[PDB]
Design a protein around this ligand. Structure first.
Ligand SMILES: Nc1nc(C(=O)O)c(CCc2ccccc2)s1
Ligand SMILES: [Zn+2]
Ligand SMILES: [Zn+2]
Length: 219
């Protein structure tokens, strides 16, 4: 029924994986994550929704010679974490913030095997950075920065045309978090949202506008 998992080169050593779900009320929702190649190793930036799509994604790269060295989930929702259970089962290291794992635990979900905390975290020193801007889409949302190509993966926090599911959002904090993200990452060449097309740094401004507007609307 749905379109198939898509894998497409974004930049040198950077691929976008897109998986799909049909959500009641929203229609067909694409979900973007990244695969980042460092030498002969691959790192997943968010998992697809399902174990099946995660297995497809991993084997696409294995079959091309890359070893999967780990995955990082940008927040606790299943469009970022759905694949952790399968990855653990393959002894592929999974990473999430401490806050994300606590939210998984509390949601009754399997957690990543490695956790980190703090505002900045190197998944791979000088190549794959994780940054916590503050709460917005969810309390735990982090973003991932790739310094060489200046690519920002913004996950479900980057929401340039509407905020999406607010079930777990903190709309009071989201404009401060987004303003912080915009100042820190305005030099990004590419910004990759979870659910909308890749754009440039202006997606950070659009997200701040959507956050402010959403705060104002709620009064
Ligand atoms: N897996 C899903 N995540 C979200 C989310 O908000 O992150 C969904 C809501 C659909 C939507 C996505 C983007 C903009 C507007 C609406 S569905
Ligand atoms: Zn989410
Ligand atoms: Zn989402």
């Amino acid at each position: 029924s749905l379109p198939d998992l898509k894998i497409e080169k974004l930049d040198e050593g950077v691929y976008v994986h897109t998986s799909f779900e049909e959500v009641n009320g929203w229609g067909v929702v694409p979900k973007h994550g990244l695969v980042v190649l460092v030498n002969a190793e691959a790192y997943l930036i968010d998992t697809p929704f399902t174990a099946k799509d995660t297995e497809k994604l991993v084997t696409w790269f294995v079959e091309r010679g890359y070893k999967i060295k780990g995955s990082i989930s940008s927040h606790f929702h299943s469009d970022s974490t759905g694949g952790i259970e399968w990855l653990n089962s393959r002894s592929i290291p999974t990473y999430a913030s401490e806050l994300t794992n606590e939210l998984l635990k509390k949601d009754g979900k399997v957690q990543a095997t490695n956790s980190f905390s703090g505002v900045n975290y190197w998944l791979v020193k000088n190549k794959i950075e994780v940054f916590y801007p503050g709460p917005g889409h969810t309390p735990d949302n982090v973003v991932v920065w790739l310094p060489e190509r200046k690519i920002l993966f913004g996950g479900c926090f980057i929401k340039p045309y509407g905020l999406g599911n607010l079930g777990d959002a903190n709309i009071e904090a989201w404009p401060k978090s987004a303003k912080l993200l915009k100042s820190k990452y305005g030099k990004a060449k590419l910004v990759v949202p979870s659910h909308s097309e890749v754009g440039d740094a202006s997606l950070l401004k659009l997200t701040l506008e959507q956050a402010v507007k959403g705060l104002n609307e709620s009064k």
